[PDB]
């Protein structure tokens, strides 16, 4: 019982490929610090193929061979949910398609054996899906569920209050016509839970942001996820989530999804005081890992309040299909940072910084449009055109606002080789965007 | 037994508040994650009154129905101390007005059912005044008290070698005739105490600070606590201590307390290292939270040895009152930073860091006063005046100084709007704040 | 079971000096937070003394008076290999100086008794050395041993996969005619094991770096640890190594080594990606501690993945010696940093990050050589020598490379105090380093 005793991970370049179609699965962590994938495995992805619950653990830099979890003849599991409880315990479910039931099964020996604890029965909706990461809501474990009946959709939580001896429908996130199907859920903290959702097929661009402060009693609808530069209208699905805090106790949000249009499983962040606030706010997004075709599904662990272990699923051809590990580097997440904002020459900018206290430190940089693929740094500087002239900008913090003064130039000098070597580099108008850390 | 599983907090505008007259108690975190306060409700504050023990759970973002620690009709319980043990089981004290006795009660099962284990007998002194977070020490867990007796006032442990089961006297940390009593005693590691204590009424704008080097054997008194800028001689109550350490490993100490007079519950901060060789070198003051009347009385919880979580209690009239909590968001604490110092032009000034290795950033602020409300951030600019000159200062850094040379000004050159746009904002004289992070 | 407990630590200035000989050893945590030392006891050095294996407990800030672990007349014990398992278990090897076998002993009760539980024959090699901190490796618990057999040298593992109750040699990382020894593992994380050794008697300045990415089936001679400026032909001996991770999740090896020709304990940090890579990487050298004559023998304890605790042993006089305590405060370790390396005027430099997105925080520093003692903030200023001229740089920054763009002096400007005073501070020429943090 040495809480002391570190197990690191390194998933970089990992990956679990055996030619099957192997996909819509969850990564988590043993108690004994063992990373593990429970997912479906097949030999095709149709509706009724071949599907079958598995457990992989990953020994010495490779994955171990499957244990089944539920397998049945004629019966196709689909996606695959679940996680590791509290207790150490190993919660997987999954739909069969053909009957549109949820199956519940729990290990307690890390995955060795499997028992079944329960059946969802459809009763009057379509189906029930299961899909996603479950997580911990005071007493009760969750395992995320969507429906459909008729035109009719549905969100919805399949809970346990006894470490996963009984379940039963719980909570109903959502209930419309707007077809949101793979939701995670995020519990950020004493009764809020954050909540990130597909939108029927996932064309359009956009995720839908909801949340709950009464541990998921009443929901609203925030909006659409927002950042400046969105994704066009691009298909998004499988979206997940991540907690993590600053080195000083800054909350964050992370988001990772996969865009089916630009091929790439991206991941964006917010402060989580914007998140609770409304939809708007996100980062712009990073690129985790390269998801060609009908790739995605990601899942995360997080050491340290800081350290995101992931995984996702890629396909090599319309077929074959295997799990790739990676790691997310966040480096310090600003406690304050603006869009890109236009500014022009010998003006005074003023931000609010929100902050608890004045930003010890704090970024100024320069671009010539509001979604640049390279921008410079501002610092005080000097040209001379005839006049003596200031170049960049001046900064004030407070403990309410940081204040920029712009000089004649906004940037640029031409004194400075390759990149402000000209009188052309020279720009009176441009944006900025200004970053500050506690 | 997944020590993996995270349970996040979210303490943000949240609040227990009853119409009741709840204060002067402390929040702690129970084994499962689930935070907790332990504290005094009554209908009043005067001694004598209907005070009461009692214990609330945070679910689901709401504070629990009280349950009944300790009460007994005719007796007036003040001041609550205790917290959770390294076992899990949770310790409430509290002295009861009429006798001046310590009475101690222990939970083994997170605050459902209490069980009465010790009474202190004041025997000589006038009383025994239980308050504050309780603490380990060794093999030693401790309940702080203060006592008086005529003209004669002491700080004492309330100390048990077995878990809570058995309890008595033991280090006496001061005796003489100096009213000090409200003490936070911090554990800073092997041997090491550091403790702040409230003097007297508290009026005087002074804390005390204490320290031990041998687990409370021996104490010195290091005065009072100082930094740049402190708290006039305003009324000071209520000290709180937490450690926390930097992205690499740098230990501070973060004070929190009540100032009556602004009526703001504010913290600072100080190195360890600092701490250890005196009372000086404690960080500018911000505010955590308004304190109206006789508010105060603060508490914490930290997670990943930098997020803190507290709790303070508010009046909302005279004889109403409440505990609300709060977040501290301390960023990347410098590692070195120098108080506001004059600065003139075209002149050299060499600072030791007094790091293990060179600083990898530094940032130099200027501001006209050393207690200023806004400042700038120095970089080397230039100006003409009809001459040649540079503006801000230049940086030279190496493994045992930060050297700076300032320019004819040492901030400001006229090019730049709203904050330096006019030859008046040219100065040659102000103040630089340096700040080293390793 | 209070795992959110907090027991900090606090060894600046500790040490463990009885006038013996006592060295060799290792530093590790107890399961409730308490740090001890378990290393070889005697009155002399040389081979053939009276040496015995020893157990100390940190109480209140004093190492306890030593438990004998292990003790025989007429056996020698030298150095002595170990630490604490997952499970809380103790273990402690050490190689009878007359025989040349291993013996190890296993604690189960934080070090208050002790049980012999393997001894390992030489057979046919001249002798099995135990030394070095052990560690897990997936179902497996290594003590590290280094062996010799005429003009042939090995190292080896003794494993136990029953959590220390059975024993036997295991993987085999080296068998050549190079006289390693002294080799320090650090696994990394799934599958990857680090390993830094000492060459013969450690003159030469070089450690050698070996990596294995199939939990020690394999190994790869990386060559020997490279930075830009290493150690000369010093003597480096008993090399230890920590894994840590910033703020935001990015990997780090941190090597703690003796030198005996400077007579220092010096630490030098490398990306993990890098060390994966190679040999090459490392960062400058940072003294620990003074390290006098026959010094040395580093161990440590990693806390919250970012606070490293550390030991080595330091002679007073050629017969006696002690246990000196520190802390390492490596501060936010660049996710990417170039060496120095020359730059001239009015010129562009690209340089590839390799981060996962833009680096949001960029240093340049200047220096007049690739080994400097002291260096210069590099800012965008100006000065003018009868023509208008840019000094220091200006920065671009994006997803792939930062470029910096010189001006006519690389920096210098000749208008601030001491270190820019004069036209002769104005250089053409130099070197400047770059630093990224995410």
């Known amino acids: ?260 249009t630009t091929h790439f499983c991206y991941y964006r962040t917010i402060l989580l005081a914007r998140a609770v606030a409304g939809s708007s706010g996100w980062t712009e997004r990073v690129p985790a890992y390269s998801a060609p075709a009908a790739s995605g599904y990601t899942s995360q662990v997080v050491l340290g309040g800081r350290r995101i272990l992931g995984n996702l699923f890629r396909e090599t051809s319309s077929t074959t299909s295997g799990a790739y590990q990676f790691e997310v580097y966040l480096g310090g997440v600003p406690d304050f940072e603006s869009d890109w904002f236009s500014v022009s020459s010998n003006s005074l900018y003023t931000l609010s910084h929100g902050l608890q206290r004045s930003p010890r430190r704090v970024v100024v940089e320069f671009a010539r449009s509001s979604s640049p693929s390279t921008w410079n740094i501002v610092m005080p500087s000097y040209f001379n055109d005839g006049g003596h002239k200031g170049s960049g900008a001046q900064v004030e913090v407070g403990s309410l606002n940081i204040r920029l003064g712009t000089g004649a130039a906004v940037w640029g000098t031409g004194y400075f080789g390759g990149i402000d070597n000209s009188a052309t580099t020279r720009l009176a108008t441009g944006y900025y965007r200004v970053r500050a850390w506690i």
Chains 1, 2, 3 share one sequence.
């Open 1 to 260: 019982m040495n809480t002391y005793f570190d197990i690191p991970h390194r998933l970089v370049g990992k990956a679990l490929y055996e030619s099957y179609y192997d996909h819509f699965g969850q990564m988590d962590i043993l108690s004994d610090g063992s990373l593990y994938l429970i997912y479906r495995r097949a030999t095709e992805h149709v509706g009724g193929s071949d599907g079958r619950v598995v457990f992989s653990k990953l020994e010495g830099g490779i994955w171990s061979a499957p244990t089944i979890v539920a397998q049945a003849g004629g019966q196709d599991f689909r996606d695959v949910a679940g996680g590791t409880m509290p207790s150490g315990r190993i919660v997987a479910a999954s739909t069969v398609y053909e009957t549109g039931e949820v199956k519940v099964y729990v290990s307690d020996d890390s995955g060795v054996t499997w028992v079944h604890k329960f059946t969802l029965a459809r009763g009057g909706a379509d189906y029930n899906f299961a899909h996603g990461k479950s997580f911990q809501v005071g007493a009760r474990y969750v395992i995320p569920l969507y429906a459909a009946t008729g035109v009719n959709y549905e969100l919805k939580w399949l809970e346990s209050s006894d470490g996963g001896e009984t379940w039963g429908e719980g909570s109903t996130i959502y209930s419309g016509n707007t077809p949101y199907n793979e939701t995670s859920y995020l519990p950020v903290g004493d009764g809020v839970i954050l909540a990130v959702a597909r939108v029927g097929s996932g064309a359009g661009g956009a995720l839908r942001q909801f949340i709950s402060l009464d541990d998921g009693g009443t929901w609203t609808d925030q909006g659409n996820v927002t950042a400046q530069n969105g994704d066009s209208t691009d298909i998004l699905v499988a979206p997940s989530l991540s907690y993590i805090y600053s080195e000083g106790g800054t909350p964050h949000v992370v988001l990772l999804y996969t865009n089916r």
